[PDB]
Design a protein around this ligand. Structure first.
Ligand SMILES: [Cu+2]
Ligand SMILES: [Cu+2]
Ligand SMILES: [Cu+2]
Ligand SMILES: [Cu+2]
Length: 504
């Protein structure tokens, strides 16, 4: 396997506007097939990148900044990863950019059927605009952007179409959180890489049934190798002081459980939807696809040390000490550029619980699915296909409780577009009884969320054999959005549903 910790961690450059005034900011981003070295000992890898970069450029905006991005497809007309056409004259390569966590008008949200081919030559049925509009009228937070094209999301994202997007709220500057050079995004992506440096993505399940098509979708993908910011098991030289890290799980399937091998602590300051009400001291944390942890690590007491960011969560088996048990390495050997004037405050933001909202609707949803003509699992939300008439139709400005029942064998990270939400509780139930009769019989009391989940979330782990309850206010915009599992192999077949936020 590839030698760990021999490449420095890339810090994606911050994207510069094409045009900017007090009234609006304008960016242009072009998807390009490019080559990049993923490790010291590998030949360059063919990848798909925003502005030809993997990851894409980091976009930094202010709260309420009127931002426009023209996302353009200049990719080849044929994919380099295996497409399974059985899961859905249309072009082979379809793309659309979704700003994950964006409080965004529906035609700028990157609807899966709002895709476009090269030069916008062909467009999906929901396509409306070339230039996307992000008003950014939302809390300061770590967002990320990635491809969302119908039935191709697992492939386009794996190809390299991911990037970070940070909203800065000037009202939070007074907290004196680590900033600028000491505010670093970490986009974590697992990959399998061939000897010749080319990306590997499976064209079928291992030793497939002859009934299965070729290529065939797989229900999950676990990469052999871990990358951070487009480099295999990198090192980051750090100064002996406080750093803020924007930790993003940009992987297809893999969930991480992160810790420091010297026994050091993380201080979590934020979740998907922004700053937590109170900072939380953690020795470890779980991070499923699309979840974000905004953390401070204090290296002040660790000068000279090499500290591994370690992973204990298995993917299709136990972690391998020499491979996927490792994420990256910090080396506390960089000379101080300046006095550490940053803070790790306890009091950060308003509790979500301050705002009282009337519960307009309680929505019960089950995670299940079926089997197709080839014998493959088809994962479904409420046993409905993507193309079935819309059923999730919250009214604009109203608050709902969603009760998500998971009788399956694994965790699903459930994501809702547009909104961030509060976690209410999790409660275990009798799976066998539910699958037989449809009746919920609880096997224990409800468990309130841990401090890490007392803030705002947009992607939430729904564990096996539990009912998860969340509360969301559906606004400020009305329109056509989506909700889905963010395991991309599940999302594409077919664990995704439209979500209509309706106006009277
Ligand atoms: Cu996403
Ligand atoms: Cu999203
Ligand atoms: Cu899933
Ligand atoms: Cu989505």
């Amino acid at each position: 396997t590839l030698e760990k910790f021999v490449d420095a961690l890339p810090i994606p450059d911050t994207l510069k506007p094409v045009q900017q005034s007090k009234e609006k900011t304008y960016y242009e981003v072009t998807m390009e097939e490019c080559t990049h070295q993923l490790h010291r000992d590998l030949p360059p890898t063919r990848l798909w990148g925003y502005n030809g970069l993997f990851p894409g450029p980091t976009i930094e905006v202010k709260r309420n900044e009127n931002v426009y991005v023209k996302w353009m497809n200049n990719l080849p007309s044929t994919h380099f990863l295996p497409i399974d056409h059985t899961i859905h004259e249309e072009p082979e390569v379809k793309t659309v950019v979704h700003l994950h966590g964006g409080v965004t008008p529906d035609d700028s949200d990157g609807y899966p059927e709002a895709w476009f081919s090269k030069d916008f030559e062909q467009t999906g049925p929901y396509f409306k605009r070339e230039v996307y509009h992000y008003p950014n009228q939302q809390r300061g937070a770590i967002l990320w952007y990635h491809d969302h094209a119908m039935a191709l999301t697992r492939l386009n994202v794996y190809a390299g179409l991911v990037g970070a997007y940070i909203i800065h709220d000037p009202k939070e500057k007074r907290l004196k959180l680590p900033s600028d050079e000491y505010d670093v995004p970490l986009l974590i992506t697992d990959r399998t890489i061939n000897e010749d440096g080319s990306l590997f993505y499976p064209s079928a399940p291992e030793n497939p049934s002859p009934s299965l098509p070729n290529p065939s979708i797989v229900p999950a993908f676990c990469g052999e190798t871990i990358l951070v910011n487009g480099k295999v098991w990198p090192y980051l030289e750090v100064e002996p002081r406080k750093y803020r890290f924007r930790v993003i799980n940009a992987s297809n399937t893999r969930t991480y459980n992160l810790s420091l091998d010297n026994g050091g602590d993380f201080i979590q300051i934020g979740s998907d939807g922004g700053l937590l009400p109170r900072s939380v001291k953690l020795n470890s944390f779980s991070l499923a696809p699309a979840e974000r942890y905004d953390i401070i690590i204090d290296f002040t007491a660790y000068e000279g040390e090499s500290i591994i960011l370690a992973n204990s969560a298995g993917c299709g088996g136990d972690v391998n000490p020499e491979t996927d048990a490792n994420i990256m390495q910090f080396r506390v050997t960089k000379p101080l550029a300046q006095k550490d004037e940053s803070r790790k405050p306890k009091y950060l933001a308003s509790y979500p619980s301050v705002q009282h909202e009337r519960i307009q609707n309680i929505r019960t949803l089950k995670l299940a699915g079926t089997q197709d003509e080839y014998g493959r699992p088809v994962l479904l939300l409420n046993n409905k296909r993507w193309h079935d008439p819309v059923t999730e139709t919250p009214k604009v400005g109203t608050t709902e409780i969603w009760s998500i029942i998971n009788p399956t064998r694994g965790t699903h990270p459930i994501h809702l577009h547009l909104v961030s939400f509060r976690v209410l509780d999790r409660r275990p139930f009798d799976i066998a009884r539910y699958q037989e009769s449809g009746e919920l019989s609880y096997t224990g009391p409800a468990v309130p969320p841990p401090p890490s989940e007392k803030g705002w979330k947009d992607t939430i782990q729904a564990h096996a054999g539990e009912v998860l309850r969340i509360a969301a206010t559906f606004g400020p915009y009305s329109g056509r959005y989506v909700w889905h599992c963010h395991i991309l192999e599940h999302e594409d077949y077919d664990m995704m549903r439209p979500m209509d936020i309706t106006d009277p």
